[PDB]
Design an enzyme around this catalytic site. Sequence first.
Site, mmCIF file in Angstrom:
data_model
loop_
_atom_site.group_PDB
_atom_site.id
_atom_site.type_symbol
_atom_site.label_atom_id
_atom_site.label_comp_id
_atom_site.label_asym_id
_atom_site.label_seq_id
_atom_site.Cartn_x
_atom_site.Cartn_y
_atom_site.Cartn_z
ATOM 1 N N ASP A 1 47.466 40.253 34.679
ATOM 2 C CA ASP A 1 46.744 41.058 33.705
ATOM 3 C C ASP A 1 47.312 42.465 33.652
ATOM 4 O O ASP A 1 47.931 42.857 32.662
ATOM 5 C CB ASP A 1 45.259 41.123 34.054
ATOM 6 C CG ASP A 1 44.578 39.781 33.957
ATOM 7 O OD1 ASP A 1 45.282 38.754 33.933
ATOM 8 O OD2 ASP A 1 43.335 39.750 33.906
ATOM 9 N N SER B 1 46.204 48.073 32.511
ATOM 10 C CA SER B 1 45.113 47.213 32.956
ATOM 11 C C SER B 1 44.384 46.740 31.709
ATOM 12 O O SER B 1 43.760 47.548 31.018
ATOM 13 C CB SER B 1 44.174 47.952 33.894
ATOM 14 O OG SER B 1 43.197 47.074 34.417
ATOM 15 N N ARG B 2 44.461 45.441 31.417
ATOM 16 C CA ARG B 2 43.866 44.941 30.183
ATOM 17 C C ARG B 2 42.365 45.187 30.149
ATOM 18 O O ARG B 2 41.812 45.523 29.096
ATOM 19 C CB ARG B 2 44.153 43.454 30.010
ATOM 20 C CG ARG B 2 45.479 43.143 29.344
ATOM 21 C CD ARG B 2 46.551 42.959 30.367
ATOM 22 N NE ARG B 2 47.745 42.316 29.827
ATOM 23 C CZ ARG B 2 48.853 42.951 29.464
ATOM 24 N NH1 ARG B 2 48.949 44.268 29.576
ATOM 25 N NH2 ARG B 2 49.878 42.255 28.996
ATOM 26 N N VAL B 3 41.682 45.014 31.280
ATOM 27 C CA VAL B 3 40.233 45.197 31.281
ATOM 28 C C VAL B 3 39.888 46.625 30.881
ATOM 29 O O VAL B 3 39.014 46.858 30.038
ATOM 30 C CB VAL B 3 39.636 44.823 32.650
ATOM 31 C CG1 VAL B 3 40.141 43.457 33.090
ATOM 32 C CG2 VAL B 3 39.949 45.876 33.693
ATOM 33 N N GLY B 4 40.582 47.599 31.458
ATOM 34 C CA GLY B 4 40.416 48.981 31.057
ATOM 35 C C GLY B 4 38.977 49.446 31.072
ATOM 36 O O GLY B 4 38.374 49.602 32.137
#
Lengths: 128, 55, 47
Positions: free
Chosen positions: A92, A117-120
Amino acid sequence: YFRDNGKHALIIYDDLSKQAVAYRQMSLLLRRPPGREAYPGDVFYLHSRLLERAAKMNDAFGGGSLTALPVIETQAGDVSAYIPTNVISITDGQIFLETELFYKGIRPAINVGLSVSRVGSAAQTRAM
Amino acid sequence: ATLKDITRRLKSIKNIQKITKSMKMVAAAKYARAERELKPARVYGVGSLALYEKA
Amino acid sequence: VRSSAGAVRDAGGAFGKREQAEEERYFRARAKEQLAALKKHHENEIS
């Protein structure tokens, strides 16, 4: 086991670039034909099937989770190599450490410019 | 480095060399003009300083 | 092997960052000046 029993776990493979080498040695000594840089063909699979087990179960399946922090080692910053690119396209986020930042005094050397960081937004406390 | 690193670096340095050659030519032209205009101003300024070194 | 336009900023070496900064500082300055002029025009055109 932990993530399946409602608990939370964190696993840190260190490194995966050496699991790749061990797999290559195995595959070459079983006589399986080599691939690119002599790694077997199934070298992406090797990691993709391994990092895909770090899930976040919903509340019906316990709610447990298993975070993963694979560690790769590049050669002179050549992120463009084979295993680095495979694992970068598997994971990710990323945390790029750079020697030019390590010696310039910035420690941890995290290259905030490239680190992602995709979740961010999600998975961050409201104050932070 | 790898082949792409070397290729990009080589292209960049080639562009830099082209630009510096062009700038050398421009500076040389402007220099020729500046010398041409400096001769008369040289005599004029030396004359204007004449007094103080004479008195 | 040849060279192409916009290659200094493709390498990303020292000259690439130097050029990027030489551009960004200048255009931040000009943006500040233009914003000041825009505020002045806003105030002068209320009436």
